[PDB]
Assembly symmetry: C3
Homo-oligomer: 559 residues x 3
């Protein structure tokens, strides 16, 4: 950086060395982006959801006592049975069933019938229900509970009701079971039939499927509809049916975002798909490795309907680069569908839930493209400055080659100029101890005389930089101080720091980037999320169970 | 960039063209921020929550058998009835009720009384309960179950218990229903009365509201309290009451963050509200468009209490810019309240849950302000460099106008100097084929002679850059090589690449910004979140339902 | 910036002032990072989870009617009792129990036995269950329900079943209670014994612990196993046991990430732990303040096993800086374990759930290190440019000190050169009103004559910049226009803007950073999260409760 010029004696070039001025500067200089159509999908988390019908006969017995002043109902007992096919299907079409219910236990037969009367046919009429909840049809909305006519006696009254409920059920992959709106569980895939690989944990022979099945809504009661494939299941206390869709009904991933104009920018490791609209950028570990998906075929349709709309609605300035679409997988588990456009002449994928990554990736990807393009101009514009700083030197040498030389080099040197060529040598510094100045200057010497040694003495003349070889006021430099000379005769000697020094240095007051400790914030804490339900799962159960145990303590004493 | 100087003959200016040196450089140069008080609110997600009282008489009958060696309890049957107003209100004030229960079914009357005895008045005393759960008062904590006195006979014992439960209920907007701690559901708004637009799906006449109602805590039993408006609801197996608040009780959005010093910075599209403390920045699509909210009036109070504290606690160096506060909506669904300060003389808003956006927006907004301010200094400081690079040229021309000229231009040119003005022309290049050098230099020529053509021949002298018009050692340039001249006589000819070339070019070894593939990370996965509950909703139900179906299979044989 | 040179008369230096050229430039110049092993932990949110065994005898009575044509089952009543120790432990070892059940109510004894027969010993054999759910052993999988033999009569049949269930329970800190797979709740810590500070809300004497207890799996029935400490609890309708672990079994925080090579970089406020692999950076409010944790001792083991592997697998180029490990807490509630390596010779912590912070912190921390290192080169490289722009001036003064001087200063000045020293003065501007040029130039004057005042007149010669003291064509500058002089005689007068002006200014076409409004996006909304469960908590309850209230309305008429 900084450079000492000892008092150097330099009346010596033995054509040391020589360099030329490059007739001209040789300016050293210092990414490939294809527009395309981006479309990203994510893992889908909404469980597969479908309509289910359930059927069931409810049998209630009330024990009713006929006292002398009033009556007491002393017990009520309600049991719910399944419904056989012969009558599931009067229910599905005409909406009639029987008011009776049969079974066999150890060979003996048990039977229940409405009002302890006879087994007849009845209609299921609609009943009321929740704003927007399951819909039911029942056959006896009245409970049979009339005191026998003899005072001081118990009579037991039977009532039977056929109940159909329409509601929906949900199942999650890999489809081991499903659950109906009202809380019922079924241990099997909604997609299972005889012989399917689909999962099945129910009785082997409580399941069966009907073909060209005729279900009708209560409002097309007695209409002949199209016919469908229906599953039927017996669960002891009810029967369940639903329509038998293939497993293709359900789709693993779902469409997240679709990006009109996006630039795919290639690198070593990966490819960055930056989109300006989504203000985000998807990176994939691919290096050109375009895939084709297998068990995600569920997407083809929409994936290629949308590409068609995009393409067509921009079709004029652009042509297709790949004839087909290709597939990429994000590190965060997103799935990219992409086809690039060139100009015309002039199982699960395991999505992480961190939407921030792709936008950070975009801040930084963006501030990169912008800093780097301004750095390129620093280059060009700065290169021009050198191209002329060069020439200028070529000139300045012609004045005095030496200084100009020392300067560029960065050390005490000396040189002569031999035409189109400059010849630099090296100097050898004289005694810093013995270096002495002389008073006189006698025509006159524009430069003072001085004498010095190395072991005997010599006599010489002072150059600028402390080099050595009417009304007259001049000033001169020496080792660590200046000299005042009136009329070619010495006057006084001021120090290097006495005479004011002029700075010419354009300050580049560029200040550097701060540290900033980024604050940790959240929109919603966990408690806030927990407290966000109306159903106190814990409250409702813990008190339920507490009360329960209290009544159970009544069954006995506690010493 | 790079520039060929053919061997050009240029003893010709027909006062081609002339330019002056701008007596001085004309330096081209290259946002408005108002401090204010920021305060952001979010969508609130904690459901509206209030105290509820429920009331109910429980009737149990036990069937108790008196055997000869021991007794068996063969049935237990428990039914829960609502409570009429005449007695809801002994309960609320004195805490007494009846041990009896009446009703009419098909004109006939049924009645139950404790211990099958007489209808009297009883006290409800406090019972035990969960650490911190619902509080109850009961009237018969004992169950009546004593064998009749005759051996080998069934007797049926009635016990009745009045039960009050204090607990809380929760309701979510738009308030279609609510649910009490213990799991009970009510199909209506907690804010509904006769004639209100509030939602109501219960029986029209099971609901009613009391005015100046007197409820007292068991500990101010028999105190005359203030009186309040209370809802009363009959749900068949219980009555429910709660205090009748207006719907203003509940608030859609809640206070998130409040920011002491924040700078609002305006743009084309939007306004950026950057805060240094929150280390974040809220952007709004407004362009000055300050709003005033309508159904969020719930905020006014706190919003303007806090502004008052802020203002006052900084009131001296600052004055109010708007006299009122104004309202803004973030793209991420936050709601900004803001009033700017100037110095003194010297339905839902749909919050997204992505806390990252505003901090990314702030990283980049920040690195922008910082890069751009350092780029401004590059400007000023670099402009100074040109201001002096200018002057320097004005000088250097005076030495030899030509080179200095070619240089700035970027092509072979030639010029004379006419006082304060320079006159540039254009040259015409001679034969590159026929260009020949001469041996002699005989006073002497400081420049060698050479002859050349265009079709006949001419004879001339070599200029620097290959232009054309005692102990003597000099060196000279020619097309693609140098010439050694001893004593004004040619010696040898070395090539352009034989003699070492000196570089003067300050290297600007600025390296550009890396690519960095940002990693995809999460703090907590989904499984981790799912596994985070103690209640296995699925476990508790699926086994519940399995067991259930097992007992149901016992009702019959299975061939 | 811009500078007026009035027509200034400057034949006056009274050795005004003088400055020297710093023999050389004095170049002003403009963070400490230690590699180490990072390892971060988070708050753990998976509740403590352990195996539980429950035991219980179920007593059912069926009321079975024997009609003349068929039989009716008119009631069923099932009660569940706990199991005493004398027989809990036949169950745990041999898997036999009694088919009978006893109790005392008000001194009187009640008893139930299977099939209303005699009290014997029975085996509990395995039963079936859910794919992968709780496992049970039962003793009577058959229900006793056989019509008495007399026509038109009720008989009541008793059946008793002993049931053991193996399942698991979960408890959350601070461990106030726990819940078993099937929905049962227990009001106490799973870690409680006599005298422990652990929490206990059950009966004081229903709890007890066995020592060297012998439980065996049904498959090592009658094997003598090791023996263990077991809790036993009576809950009225069942007994529960589990193994009695210490509370150390459970750990508050869990291991999140572990980082091979990471650089810890110190600042004023904080320390930044940046890791290149995790592409993230953890900041801590510490300032060297290394902690040691207290109730997180659960980590020591793994924390220091992993440090050992890391260390050893890089042990050669690195040595340990601290002999022990030290502990830090992130602002986002992460807990850093860290030990730094130097080269060899050549309660809860409250984790926030915002994974984005540490990566933003890293984008910006990174773009800082990179911008700042390129800014350092701007410095060095730009400093060199000044170092030579300096020297060049030292030269150019020797041509004409004045202009060179005015230039560097930035105002009209004038100077002479006194050897190694330059002496600057100040000038005094003459009349802008009265400033007049003369026609002649008669040997000749290379500069025209002009006369001017201040109040009387004077006569003088024009300098460059408007200063004042055969075939001849020259051109000259004056106040706001130029002058054409043919043969030392005036010709015409063109304006400052008539003659074309040459620009030499290297354009630094650096453009500044854009604003970018960052888009607000989420991967999964709330509805999407809510809709993601199969169990409609609300559906299953609201319809449950609706139906319930419907049957309750049957108990009476409604005028
Ligand atoms: C009721 O009658 C129908 C028609 O004969 C028959 O299929 C059904 O089994 C009968 N049910 C009972 C309970 O006897
Ligand atoms: C399921 O398979 C059957 C027969 O192969 C077909 O008729 C039905 O439409 C399929 N479902 C779909 C939508 O592919
Ligand atoms: C001037 O430059 C230095 C380093 O180059 C820096 O420390 C300082 O902050 C700068 N000042 C301003 C106001 O930019
Ligand atoms: C019990 O007595 C009170 C007081 O006369 C009365 O209001 C109530 O209806 C009676 N209840 C029954 C169950 O008879
Ligand atoms: C609700 O309205 C009533 C009467 O207009 C009023 O007395 C009551 O205080 C209101 N609630 C509030 C807090 O505005
Ligand atoms: C030197 O500069 C070039 C381009 O200007 C760049 O490729 C290289 O990385 C730089 N070297 C260093 C060490 O900064
Ligand atoms: C059944 O017998 C065993 C063995 O004597 C005894 O411990 C138990 O109390 C008896 N149980 C009943 C219900 O009598
Ligand atoms: C719990 O404490 C007991 C006795 O002090 C000990 O035997 C047992 O192993 C402890 N548990 C652990 C794993 O520290
Ligand atoms: C040229 O520079 C100016 C300011 O220095 C800027 O406004 C403009 O965008 C630049 N042009 C380009 C193409 O970089």
């Amino acid at each position: 950086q900084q450079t000492s010029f000892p008092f150097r004696v330099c009346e010596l070039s033995s054509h040391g060395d020589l360099f030329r001025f490059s007739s001209d500067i040789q300016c050293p200089s210092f990414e490939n982006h294809t527009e395309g159509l981006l479309m990203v999908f994510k893992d889908n988390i909404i469980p597969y959801s479908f309509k289910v019908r359930s059927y069931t006969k409810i049998v209630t017995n009330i024990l009713i006592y006929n006292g002398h002043r009033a009556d007491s109902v002393t017990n009520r007992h309600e049991e719910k049975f399944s419904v056989d096919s012969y009558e599931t299907d009067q229910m599905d079409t005409i909406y009639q069933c029987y008011n009776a219910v049969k079974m066999t236990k150890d060979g003996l037969t048990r039977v229940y019938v409405d009002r302890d009367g006879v087994n007849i046919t009845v209609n299921l009429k609609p009943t009321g229900g929740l704003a927007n909840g399951v819909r039911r049809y029942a056959s006896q909305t009245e409970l049979y509970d009339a005191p026998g006519r003899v005072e001081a006696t118990y009579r037991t009254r039977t009532t039977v009701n056929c109940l159909i409920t329409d509601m929906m059920a949900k199942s999650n992959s890999p489809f081991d079971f499903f659950v109906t709106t009202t809380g019922q569980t079924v241990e099997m895939s909604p997609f299972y039939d005889g012989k399917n690989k689909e999962t099945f944990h129910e009785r082997a022979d409580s399941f069966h499927v009907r073909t060209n099945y005729k279900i009708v809504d209560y409002d097309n009661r007695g209409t002949n509809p199209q016919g469908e494939r229906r599953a039927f299941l017996d669960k002891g206390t009810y029967t369940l049916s639903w329509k038998l869709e293939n497993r293709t009904a359900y789709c693993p991933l779902q469409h997240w975002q679709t990006f009109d104009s996006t630039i795919a920018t290639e690198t070593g490791k990966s490819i960055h798909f930056v989109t300006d609209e989504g203000t985000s950028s998807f990176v994939t570990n691919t290096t050109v490795g375009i895939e084709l998906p297998d068990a995600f075929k569920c997407i083809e349709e929409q994936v290629n309907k949308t590409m068609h709309e995009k393409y067509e609605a921009v079709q004029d300035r652009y042509t297709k680069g790949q004839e087909a679409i290709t597939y990429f997988i994000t590190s965060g588990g997103l799935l990219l569908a992409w086809l690039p456009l060139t100009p015309r002449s002039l199982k699960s994928l395991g999505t992480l839930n961190n939407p921030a990554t792709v936008q950070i990736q975009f801040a930084y990807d963006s501030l990169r493209r912008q800093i780097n393009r301004m750095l390129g101009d620093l280059a060009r514009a700065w290169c021009l400055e050198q191209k002329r700083q060069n020439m200028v030197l070529r000139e300045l040498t012609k004045i005095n080659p030496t200084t100009v030389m020392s300067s560029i080099y960065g050390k005490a040197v000396a040189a002569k100029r031999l035409g189109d060529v400059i010849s630099v040598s090296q100097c050898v510094p004289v005694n810093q101890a013995t270096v002495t100045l002389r008073k006189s200057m006698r025509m006159c010497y524009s430069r003072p005389l001085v004498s010095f040694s190395f072991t005997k003495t010599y006599e010489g003349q002072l150059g600028t930089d402390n080099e050595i070889f009417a009304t007259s006021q001049y000033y001169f430099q020496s080792g660590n101080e200046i000299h005042v000379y009136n009329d070619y005769h010495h006057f006084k000697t001021i120090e290097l720091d006495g005479i004011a020094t002029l700075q010419t240095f354009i300050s580049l007051n560029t200040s550097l980037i701060e540290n900033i400790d980024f604050a940790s914030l959240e929109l919603y804490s966990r408690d806030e999320q927990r407290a966000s339900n109306v159903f106190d799962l814990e409250g409702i159960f813990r008190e339920y169970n507490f009360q329960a145990q209290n009544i159970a303590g009544l069954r006995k004493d506690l010493d």
